[PDB]
Amino acid sequence: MPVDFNGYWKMLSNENFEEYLRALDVNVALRKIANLLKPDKEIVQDGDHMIIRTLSTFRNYIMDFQVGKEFEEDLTGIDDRKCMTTVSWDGDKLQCVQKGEKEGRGWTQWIEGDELHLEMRAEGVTCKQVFKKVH
Numbered sequence: 656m657p658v659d660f661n662g663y664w665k666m667l668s669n670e671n672f673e674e675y676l677r678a679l680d681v682n683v684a685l686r687k688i689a690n691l692l693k694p695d696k697e698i699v700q701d702g703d704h705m706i707i708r709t710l711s712t713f714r715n716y717i718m719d720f721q722v723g724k725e726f727e728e729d730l731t732g733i734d735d736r737k738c739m740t741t742v743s744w745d746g747d748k749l750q751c752v753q754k755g756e757k758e759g760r761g762w763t764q765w766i767e768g769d770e771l772h773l774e775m776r777a778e779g780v781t782c783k784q785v786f787k788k789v790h
């Protein structure tokens with residue numbers, strides 16, 4: 656059953672993000688800036704169609720996709736690499752593979768109550784982010 660992500664979700668915690676960005680070959684200044692920044696996720700869900708807006712004062716990162724489709728994702732801000740990205744529905748878990756340069760590149764996102772729980776992977780290394788629903 657595909658879970659309803661429609662809303663504005665504010666960050667509670669950010670765990671292992673400097674090690675995830677070091678696994679993408681990112682500079683030390685952008686690792687310290689992006690681990691100090693707490694973004695707001697605005698998600699608009701329409702069945703398989705999804706707009707995920709990761710909102711911040713330094714850079715806003717918007718992912719627009721249909722679940723099912725392998726799309727051209729430029730990760731502009733993070734590392735600036737083009738991945739062939741396929742996102743699939745496992746009921747509660749929204750499960751993604753990013754096809755390109757890195758070993759086991761992807762992400763898994765799910766709802767626990769009012770909390771969005773995100774795992775992001777690059778070269779095995781998993782960053783864990785928690786966001787609470789407010790509007």
Ligand SMILES: CC1=C(/C=C/C(C)=C/C=C/C(C)=C/CO)C(C)(C)CCC1
Binds near residue numbers: 711715732
């Ligand atoms: C570089 C960078 C950032 C990294 C954003 C990332 C890594 C977003 C990932 C979003 C996902 C995985 C969406 C699909 O569920 C943010 C905007 C925080 C702060 C400014 C610099």
